[PDB]
Structure formats: structure tokens, C-alpha cells
Amino acid sequence: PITGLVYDQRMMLHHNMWDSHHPELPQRISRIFSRHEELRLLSRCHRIPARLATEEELALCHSSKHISIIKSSEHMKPRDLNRLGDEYNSIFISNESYTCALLAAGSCFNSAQAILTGQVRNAVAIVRPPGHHAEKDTACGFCFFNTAALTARYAQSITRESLRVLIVDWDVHHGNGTQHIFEEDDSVLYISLHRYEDGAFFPNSEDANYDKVGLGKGRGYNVNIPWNGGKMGDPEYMAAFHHLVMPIAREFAPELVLVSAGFDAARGDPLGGFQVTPEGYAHLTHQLMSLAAGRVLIILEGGYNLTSISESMSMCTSMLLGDSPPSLDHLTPLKTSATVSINNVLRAHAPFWSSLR
Ligand SMILES: O=C(CCCCCCC(=O)Nc1ccccc1)NO
Ligand SMILES: [Cl-]
Ligand SMILES: [Cl-]
Ligand SMILES: [Cl-]
Ligand SMILES: [K+]
Ligand SMILES: [K+]
Ligand SMILES: [Mg+2]
Ligand SMILES: [Zn+2]
């Protein structure tokens, strides 16, 4: 099979001991997996096994202190788990959390390996907990280790240090961790689309604004597309891809594409409040398949409406498998503030990308 799929039910074990209804539910991944079975997608994929990341692999992006603190939670008593989790912004921890975070990362390493060794062309990773808010030295926003960032470094470690990796982060939240890890790096192009609301939207930092273009040799290699003042959906995401994501990506000419694929911009998501449709996600996936000779790895991040994420991620897998993509309306006018956002990013990045000039 041309498309790989990784899913391990052991990643369900991470749970919130004090609020069993917290939206980052174990069943997020099992529901997505079940939908792949219902739609007969699973048997069309080559099944890639999950594995644990090693501590040496975590050190590709994370400090020894951070690794050690999260590792220490594996045998903590409940009171200590509660106290430790409360030291971070929006984290809960159970004794299974560390191992689940290792499995999420190792699953993605095995998927990247399968792509880069030619065993599969592309792949999807149905993993939790998510990764993109995790920083070198801290956990944040339901994330412990930065799975996508680690996977970029892991990919480089089996090919070449300078292997060009594009990370497209279409989760509705800004991947602050990923931005920071690669901020000074021109080998990893980070492009995030995210709700911003001038800082009112999590993670509530001006680091997510369009004027953060990267640092030093990384200038130009961090592209933030922030949305303000409007319920964005397919038209806006399509326009961002047309004017920004795809021209920059084609110029960068990645050798591997990782998608930080949260489905919390989806219609029905309680945290995102946006209206991207499953066909919208299919369109975006199919666009990214035109890059890197098709070498695309879709990594689950956020997304909290169980039916919505199941349908949306399954449509992405369908695209990876070669199914016919959707024809959507590129003429629908955008929300006025979306035009402003796109124009702000264009102005910020035109100094770095000839495709924008
Ligand atoms: O999807 C995410 C999760 C980021 C963490 C969001 C914290 C703020 C928030 O919306 N918290 C929340 C909302 C409803 C119920 C429980 C927590 N990142 O991509
Ligand atoms: Cl159906
Ligand atoms: Cl199947
Ligand atoms: Cl501007
Ligand atoms: K994002
Ligand atoms: K970068
Ligand atoms: Mg450049
Ligand atoms: Zn999110």
C-alpha cells in the first residue's frame, strides 16, 4: 500500500483523573480509527507499528530537565500528579501520560522512516497526546513533547542534517513550541494558520502574530497566518493556501512534509469555533501532496468534536490513498478580516520569498 497508518490503543491510557469530561479525551483516537474501519480505509493502508521514542530521541528538541520531570510522573501518587500538572498552562497528567507521549512520538518516527525508506509514499498518525505547544523546556496546552518537531529532527537524523522539512500546522491554535524550536533554523519551514484574535485566543501570545518571521538565519522560515474577527472556513483556508502556503512551500522545495493536523478548525468544534469542512481538509491535503514528491505525514494534534475529527481525518487519509479530490468554491468572498490577515502576512514575507514578489 502506498499509504501508511499508525494507531495504537495504548495511547488511550493518558487521561484526566479530575475531570473525565475534559475535551482531550482518550476516545478521540479510537473514534478516528473506528471511522477508518467504517469507511474501509484501514485495509487500504499499510499498518505501521507504534513504538516508544527513546530519551535520546526526545533530546533532539527537549532539555534533559524537561524530559526528567515528565518521566518522573510515571510513578507519582495522585496528589503529586495534580500538583505537577498545575505547574503548567493547561496540562493534566496521569501515570500513563509519559508513556503515551513517547508512543505518539515513536509512532511518528516509524511513519517518517517508512516514508523516507520508500516503504510507503505518505502516511497518517492517529496519536495523542498532541505535541505542538510543547517547548524545549516545558509542557503546555495538552502537550508534553513536540511530536512534529521531534519527527522533523528524526527525519534529518536518518537522511541529512539539512533535509528540508516543511511543517504545516492547520490546527486552529498556534504551535508556539514548534515555532520556537525552529525559530533560528532555515532547514525547517514552519507555517501555521491559527485563530489569534489579537491575543485573546490560546496560547494568548503575540508570538503568534504575522510579524514573527523567524530569527537570524531562520528569517523567512516562520510563517504565521493569524485570524481575527471572523468565523473562518473553507474559503479563507483555501485562499491562505493559494496566496501564501503553496507559493512559499513550492519555493522552499521540501523533501518531507509534516502536517500538524489538528481538526479543531472544523465545523462543530467546541474550542475552535470555525467552519472548515471535511472536504476543506481534503482539499488542503491534496494540495500538500503536490510537494516533496508526495512525501506527506499527517500527525493528529487537536480537534474535540468526535464526529467531526473522525470524518475530517478520514477524508485526509482518503486523499493520501489517491481518491478524487473535492471541487470547492474559490470565488466565495472571504470574511473581510481574512483578506487583511493574508495581506499582512504577504507584506511580512515578501522580503524573503521571491514567489511573493
Ligand atoms: O488544541 C489545542 C489545545 C490547546 C489548549 C487549550 C487551552 C485553552 C482551552 O480552550 N481550554 C479548555 C476549553 C474547554 C474545556 C477545557 C479546556 N491545541 O492545539
Ligand atoms: Cl457513511
Ligand atoms: Cl478497512
Ligand atoms: Cl502589515
Ligand atoms: K496552527
Ligand atoms: K523555521
Ligand atoms: Mg527564504
Ligand atoms: Zn488546537
Q: Which of 66, 133, 174, 180 is catalytic?
A: 133
Nearest to 24 by CA among 87, 99, 90, 76: 90
Instruction: Give, as one character, the DSSP assignment of residue 322.
Output: T
In short, whether 169's Cβ falls inside 6 Å of ligand 1 is no
Method: X-ray
Residue to mutate (ligand 1; options 202, 259, 274, 300; most atoms within 8 A of CB) = 202
Owner of C-alpha cell 502576512: 345
Q: How far apart are CA 135 and CA 137, in angstroms?
A: 5
Q: Residue 225 corresponds to which cell in the numbers above?
A: 497566518
Distance of CA 215 to the CA centre of its chain: 22
CA distance 344 to 214: 16
Phi, psi of 58 (to 5 degrees): -60, -30
- 188 forms beta bridges with 165
- Residue 229 DSSP SS3: coil
Separation of CA 92 from chain center: 20
Q: How many angstroms is the resolution?
A: 1.3
Q: Which atom of ligand 1 is nearest to the CA of 22?
A: 16
The C-alpha atoms of residue 275 and residue 248 are separated, in whole angstroms, by: 25
User: Is 22 among the residues known to form the active site?
Assistant: no
Cα gap 312→170, rounded to integer Å: 12
DSSP output for 140-192: BTTBSS-HHHHHHHHHHHTS-TT--EEEEE-SSS--HHHHHHTTT-SSEEEEE
Is 131:169 a contact under the CB 8 Å cutoff? no
Residue of minimum CA distance from atom 12 in ligand 1: 271
CB atoms within 10 A of CB 313: 30
How far apart are alpha carbons 340 and 210 in whole angstroms? 11
Output the known binding site.
171, 173, 264
Peptide bond into 226 cis (omega under 30): no
Q: Whose CA is nearest to atom 6 of ligand 1?
A: 141
Question: Cell match 469530561: residue?
Answer: 21
Using alpha carbons only, give the angle 103, 125, 62 rounded to the nearest 5 degrees: 45
Topology of domain 1-357, per CATH? Arginase; Chain A (3.40.800)
Please state, in angstroms and rounded to a whole number, the distance separating the CA atoms of residues 193 and 203: 13
Cα–Cα separations (whole angstroms), residue 101 to 140, 260, 277: 13, 15, 29
